Design a protein around this ligand. Structure first.
Ligand SMILES: Nc1nc2c(ncn2[C@@H]2O[C@H](COP(=O)(O)OP(=O)(O)OP(O)(O)=S)[C@@H](O)[C@H]2O)c(=O)[nH]1
Ligand SMILES: C=C[C@@]1(C)CC(=O)[C@]2(O)[C@@]3(C)[C@@H](O)CCC(C)(C)[C@@H]3[C@H](O)[C@H](OC(C)=O)[C@@]2(C)O1
Ligand SMILES: Nc1ncnc2c1ncn2[C@@H]1CC[C@H](COP(=O)(O)OP(=O)(O)OP(=O)(O)O)O1
Ligand SMILES: [Cl-]
Ligand SMILES: [Mg+2]
Ligand SMILES: [Mg+2]
Ligand SMILES: [Zn+2]
Ligand SMILES: [Zn+2]
Lengths: 189, 329, 188
């Protein structure tokens, strides 16, 4: 074999959640690196606990971006609810941490459901990850989301079985990717 | 057993055509009519447009025809052309004008599709409203390939998944996607395009480009153990150019002046010594590359080919089935 | 979480990859595109074994962007110069990749240096990462850079110069969250 062995496997019917700190660069520009990492660690460790309960699997942390998915490793039907529930717990966590810290912590949540290829790349410093247009869309939904709210796509809503009262998301106005691809958005209540 | 074969070669080498033969051999005509009419139109306007730009310029053998020329050029860039009965009359009038014909004999000095002569020789057939494309018409109709296409077929209950890709420089970036897990590679080459240059830049010799592309595929880091079946396609047009005597091979490839026909060489019944020599010379330029590196990790299988001949393809593809199944590919 | 003083971070992106990535039946829903990315990232990881690069710590792979740093091991400023030598090496690897895959991928690098905090974060897995304003500005030097060029900050420009490198003023660009910053392009 001339192509390196690739550790990747496809998975259908999964949900992805993206959450990102608002104006993180601006934040790190005022408080000490030591102090920032602590506020960030206070928040992300709390997130890692919530994920275990909600049956969501944490992928990785990119500074202020935090993402996880449901339907991994083993398939699940309750999948889209888990992420909605996860966001619910997350948005609340941030509030408590903002309360006791005094730091301006605010995150945008974005969810979409579909397929993903997942595994690792390269030979060194392996880290499990996800790849697909669906994952690309999820990331854009977070960018298109609104502070302290759980922004979702129509594909995700078709998996909630109507257990949540939502409202027009208007993502096509906030993010050019969502518009050009004709994505119908919704905000959870 | 399921073998996945990938078709590679420079633009216009005849890949898409090889696939059509697999359909006609082992597997909505009205849709192809518009395409045939497009080849017919593109041909007449390409020849006419090159008349004034050549050096020296070619002159019309009839003043009357200048009006048909002005007509042709005026409707050149038209999007939705309805093909009035006047169009075929004008086209045919020009194609009979010796000036136009002489310009056609110098078509290696500009970019002209391969089916020019074929379709122009039968304008009266294509113009009919009850016109139904023959098998030879569909095999000639040229239409650029963009993106990957996967064909399926069976031969004695053996499965073949064929992949057809774009051969033009840009389209090549996609080839990679078919590299992993390929049984064999079929590399097509337009043997007759030695006196020509690629569309992409209008300078690089067509055969040279092929040679480079082959050497790139043969020594690819990902195709180290993938054997390559080589179709020295367009055999018919090669022989015609050779015998014609106008465009001399040794003027494009100086090495030809030293080349002599090998002893183990097998000519076709009644084949001209000159033709035998040309086709074999071209074969060796390709073999010379494949012989420099490999070490039995992978091999090269030459084949004289003529894609538009449903008969020659039947025969050669049978030589191919032998190659695949035999060597355990 | 150990605190560092002088660390050189680098973000090398392949902006053209996203476009090359497609999802079709032929390419197995984008698996074949990832096979190429896998090859690319591997070809980059092999440089870490070259003795001249033993001081380079591969942090992680963000998407198709390669993130690394030098100085996590502490002739003073040479580690920052070594980072630039690695940025050039990555280009040589991508040109090799281009030759065999018939593509024209170009790397876009952003380098910066300063204080950082290194360590593991979170309760799931023990992934070593680095933080700080420095890391943020490094990444901005990448996202606002140019293809085939290494974009460095003014402070890094000075240091690279004492080491014998020549820079070119990019101008004064407004970096999101930071404001007007004066940047430089390293001269190949
Ligand atoms: N005379 C002759 N014409 C041929 C032969 N093989 C192909 N052609 C013609 O050459 C033209 C180009 O062939 P085609 O199959 O379209 O090229 P291709 O390799 O698929 O081209 P591309 O899609 O990479 S741009 C067509 O008109 C075809 O009929 C041959 O053996 N003899
Ligand atoms: C490799 C291709 C492709 C399309 C796959 C994919 O889903 C991504 O890797 C995600 C979305 C995805 O892996 C989640 C993490 C992150 C960092 C958000 C990625 C980047 O945005 C990638 O783009 C870049 C620019 O690297 C992107 C979009 O690239
Ligand atoms: N350890 C790290 N790993 C990966 N990426 C990192 C790391 N540290 C920082 N980053 C990156 C580069 C800068 C980026 C954070 O900026 P981001 O793009 O989120 O903008 P922002 O938070 O200022 O504003 P916003 O998200 O609201 O648009 O995260
Ligand atoms: Cl060719
Ligand atoms: Mg942010
Ligand atoms: Mg074709
Ligand atoms: Zn971010
Ligand atoms: Zn198939």
């Amino acid at each position: 074999m001339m192509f390196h062995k690739i550790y990747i496997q496809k998975h259908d019917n999964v949900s992805i959640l993206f959450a990102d700190i608002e104006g993180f660069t601006s934040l790190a520009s005022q408080c000490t690196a030591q102090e920032l990492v602590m506020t960030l660690n206070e928040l992300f460790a709390r997130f890692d606990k919530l994920a275990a309960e909600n049956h969501c699997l944490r992928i990785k942390i990119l500074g202020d971006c935090y993402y996880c998915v449901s339907g991994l490793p083993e398939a699940r039907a309750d999948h889209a609810h888990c992420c909605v529930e996860m966001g619910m717990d997350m948005i609340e966590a941030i509030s408590l941490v903002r309360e006791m810290t005094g730091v301006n912590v605010n995150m945008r949540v974005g969810i979409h459901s579909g397929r993903v290829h997942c595994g690792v790349l390269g030979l060194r410093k392996w880290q499990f990850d996800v790849w697909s247009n669906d994952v690309t869309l999820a990331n854009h939904m977070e960018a298109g989301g609104k502070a302290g709210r759980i922004h979702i796509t129509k594909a995700t809503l078709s998996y909630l079985n109507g257990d949540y009262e939502v409202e027009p998301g208007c993502g096509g106005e906030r993010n050019a990717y969502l518009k050009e691809h004709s994505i119908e958005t919704f905000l959870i209540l | 057993a399921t073998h996945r074969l990938l078709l590679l070669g420079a633009g216009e080498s005849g890949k898409s055509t090889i696939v059509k033969q697999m359909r006609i051999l082992h597997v909505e005509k009205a849709t192809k009519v518009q395409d045939i009419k497009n080849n017919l139109k593109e041909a007449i306007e390409t020849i006419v447009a090159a008349m004034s730009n050549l050096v020296p310029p070619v002159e019309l053998a009839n003043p009357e025809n200048q009006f048909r020329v002005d007509y042709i050029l005026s409707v050149m860039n038209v999007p939705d052309f309805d093909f009035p009965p006047e169009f075929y009359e004008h086209a045919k009038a020009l194609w009979e004008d010796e000036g136009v014909r002489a310009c056609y004999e110098r078509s290696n000095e500009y970019q002209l599709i391969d089916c020019a002569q074929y379709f122009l020789d039968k304008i009266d057939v294509i113009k009919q409203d009850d016109y139904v494309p023959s098998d030879q018409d569909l095999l000639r109709c040229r239409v650029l390939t963009s993106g990957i296409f996967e064909t399926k077929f069976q031969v004695d209950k053996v499965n073949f998944h064929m992949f057809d890709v774009g051969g033009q420089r840009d389209e090549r970036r996609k080839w990679i996607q078919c590299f992993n897990d390929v049984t064999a590679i079929i590399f097509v080459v337009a043997s007759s395009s030695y006196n020509m240059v690629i569309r992409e830049d209008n300078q690089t010799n067509r055969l040279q480009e092929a040679l480079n592309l082959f050497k790139s595929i043969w020594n690819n880091r990902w195709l180290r153990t993938i054997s390559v079946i080589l179709f020295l396609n367009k055999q018919d047009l090669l022989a015609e150019k050779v015998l014609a005597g106008k465009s001399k091979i040794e003027d494009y490839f100086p090495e030809f002046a030293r080349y002599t026909t090998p002893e183990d060489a097998t000519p076709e019944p009644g084949e001209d010594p000159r033709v035998t020599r040309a086709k074999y010379f071209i074969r060796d330029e390709f073999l010379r590359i494949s012989t420099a590196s490999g070490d039995g990790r992978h091999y090269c299988y030459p084949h004289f080919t003529c894609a538009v001949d449903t008969e020659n393809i039947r025969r050669v593809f049978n030589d191919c089935r032998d190659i695949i199944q035999r060597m355990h590919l | 979480h150990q605190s560092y003083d002088c660390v050189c971070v680098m973000f090398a992106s392949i902006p053209d990859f996203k476009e090359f990535y497609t999802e079709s039946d032929v390419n197995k829903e984008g698996l074949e595109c990832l096979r190429l990315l896998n090859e690319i990232i591997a070809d980059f990881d092999d440089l870490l074994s070259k003795p001249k690069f033993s001081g380079v710590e591969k942090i992680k792979t963000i998407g198709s962007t390669y993130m690394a740093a030098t100085g996590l091991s502490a002739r003073q400023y040479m580690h920052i110069g070594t980072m630039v030598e690695f940025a050039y090496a990555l280009v040589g690897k991508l040109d090799a990749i281009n030759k065999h895959s018939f593509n024209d991928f170009k790397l876009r690098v952003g380098i910066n240096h300063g204080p950082v905090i290194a360590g593991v974060i979170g309760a799931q897995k023990p992934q070593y990462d680095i933080w700080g304003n420095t890391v943020n500005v490094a990444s901005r030097m990448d996202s606002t850079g140019v293809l085939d060029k290494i974009q460095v900050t003014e402070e890094t420009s000075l240091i690279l110069q004492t080491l014998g490198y020549t820079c070119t003023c990019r101008g004064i660009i407004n970096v999101k969250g930071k404001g007007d910053l004066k940047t430089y392009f390293v001269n190949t």
